[PDB]
């Protein structure tokens, strides 16, 4: 059970080492959806291998691993997109060669509303100065939380990731009150990320 | 599923 | 700025005092898909009126513009109905207490097409609150967080809402410490409670899909208020 | 206007 025995700093380096790469896109309502679909499909292959490296994930049955990735995959793609778009205000960096703005989200019906929500999430992360070590913790929380003996083990790993986030904030010099406030701010953004995935899944259903 | 095969 | 100058104990008392009452349904003593959806929509409509009174009593909500108040309630109204339903169903395992005279199990949720899926998620959240031994003081903090947080990302005024949200964070930690939880247990439980809010958002969005399908199939007549609250998500 | 708009004023 080498997931509960990891130190806070070991959790960070393990999640940082497991980070997937930044893929390129092969670049109307059909052309852009084709690029986003092709991009997301290739990202999913890397996501599955990243998930297998999140501490505590492989301890689950293959059925639970499937269920967690089925429920969380779009959230994980979205927080990834939001993270790499932080240093591009008003733009979404789907790929280094595919940097789209809000207006280019009007080519697909209903896409611009979700574009606006993603841009607002990026602005929120930018205003909080979200750190990379915090980002990988949040993304692992999304994986383990969005579909949750076996349930207790998932909550044990989730508590360890909480300990890791608090460890990073204490390491940055935040006071005890600032750690709790910042922890809450980060986890409440996951509620909005869930909302964006729910909406995006509804429209992706419309195929 | 394919997700099952990839895992 | 008089919400930001509240102590943690004053925040709890104000939230407890603002709690809406538990309403009854007009139960009929046979269930059709339409008759059950009518009871629930009638109850939800009457609860929305009380929710608006409650929201005006949440510290800091008065300070926002009328446009910002509408947006927050439009975004979170179904989450707020659901967390209240999950809370009052805690002591009824395997059952949802919509009203003291309307207590249903999942097999009665099968009366409505697509309802049992949401039913099962609400029952699961109820048992999660039960395993965590969620306290009433923590519940009213979580419900006020939903009100202020759910619509904050889809808007200076933002800074005020987040300052109030931070105050509720302070209040939650204060409750956990007064209850004797260790400092590590405090941030662990804070995280556990806030991650449940993502499940509540998930259930609200699935519930909004179901309500929209009931409207688009003429199963039940929705009130104009309910029609407007639903239209805000479409 | 809106019913919610009206109810918040009342
Ligand atoms: O869904 S959205 O939020 O955007 C909209 C909005 C309205 C209408 C839409 F059509 C899309 C969503 C946000 C952003 O834009 C859409 C989208 C996406 C995702 C998956 C897709 O296909 C998956 C199909 N696969 C094949 C089969 C296996 C499973 C996976 C297609 C598009 C996005 C996206 C893509 C890659 C990222 O790194 C981050 C985000
Ligand atoms: C449309 N709809 C569905 N599908 N479930 C609901 C559930 C409620 C509810 C009523 C009272 C208290 C809590 C929730 C209201 N509307 C609902």
Question: Which burial class, exposed, middle or buried, applies to C177 when counting CB atoms under 10 A from its CB (0-12, 13-18, 19+)?
Answer: middle
Give the class (CATH, top level) of C1-234: mainly alpha
Query: According to the entry, how was the structure determined?
Result: X-ray
Residue A192's nearest CA partner among A121, A130, A143, A128 is A121
Architecture of domain A1-207: Orthogonal Bundle (1.10)
A43 is in an annotated binding site: yes
Q: Count the neighbouring beta carbons within 10 Å of the beta carbon of residue C216.
A: 8
CA angle, A142 then A145 then A149, to 5°: 145
Give, to the nearest 10 degrees, the angle between helix A132-145 and helix A62-84: 140
Q: Is the CB of C233 under 6 A from ligand 2?
A: no
Question: Which burial class, exposed, middle or buried, applies to C154 when counting CB atoms under 10 A from its CB (0-12, 13-18, 19+)?
Answer: middle
- Asked whether C80 and C143 are in contact (CB, 8 A), the reply is yes
Q: Is C183's Cβ below 8 Å from some Cβ in A?
A: yes
A195 is in an annotated binding site: no
Q: Is the CB of A158 under 6 A from ligand 1?
A: no
Ligand in closest contact with the CA of C118: 2
Q: Which residues of D touch C49 (CB under 8 A)?
A: 7
Q: Count the neighbouring beta carbons within 10 Å of the beta carbon of residue A145.
A: 25
Distance CA A25, CA A98 (A): 7
Distance CA C220, CA A159 (A): 44
The DSSP code sequence of A180-193 is HHHHHHHHHHHHHH
Distance CA C17, CA B5 (A): 55
| Backbone torsions φ then ψ of C202, nearest 5 degrees | -60, -45
Assign C99 to helix, strand or coil.
Answer: strand
Q: Which helix (H) or strand (E) holds A95?
A: strand A91-95
Distance (Å) of CA C142 to CA A152, A186, C207: 23, 15, 20
Q: Which residues of A touch C153 (CB under 8 A)?
A: 117, 120-121, 124, 189, 192
Residue A14's nearest CA partner among A156, A172, A164 is A164
């Amino acid at each position: 059970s080498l997931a509960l025995s990891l130190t806070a700093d070991q959790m960070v380096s393990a999640l940082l080492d497991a980070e997937p790469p930044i893929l390129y896109s092969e670049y109307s309502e059909a052309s852009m959806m084709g690029l986003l679909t092709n991009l997301a499909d290739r990202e999913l292959v890397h996501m599955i291998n990243w998930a297998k490296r999140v501490p505590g994930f492989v301890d689950l049955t293959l059925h639970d691993q499937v269920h967690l990735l089925e429920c969380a995959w779009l959230e994980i793609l979205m927080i990834g997109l939001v993270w790499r778009s932080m240093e591009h205000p008003g733009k979404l960096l789907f790929a280094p060669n595919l940097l789209l703005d809000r207006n280019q989200g009007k080519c697909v019906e209903g896409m611009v509303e979700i574009f606006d929500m993603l841009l607002a999430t990026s602005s929120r992360f930018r205003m909080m100065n979200l750190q990379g070590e915090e980002f990988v913790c949040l993304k692992s929380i999304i994986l383990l939380n969005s579909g949750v003996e076996e349930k207790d083990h998932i909550h044990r790993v989730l508590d360890k990731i909480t300990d890791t986030l608090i460890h990073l904030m204490a390491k940055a010099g935040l006071t005890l009150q600032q750690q709790h406030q910042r922890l809450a701010q980060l986890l409440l953004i996951l509620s909005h990320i869930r909302h964006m995935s729910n909406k995006g899944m509804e429209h992706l259903y419309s195929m | 599923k394919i997700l099952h095969r990839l895992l």
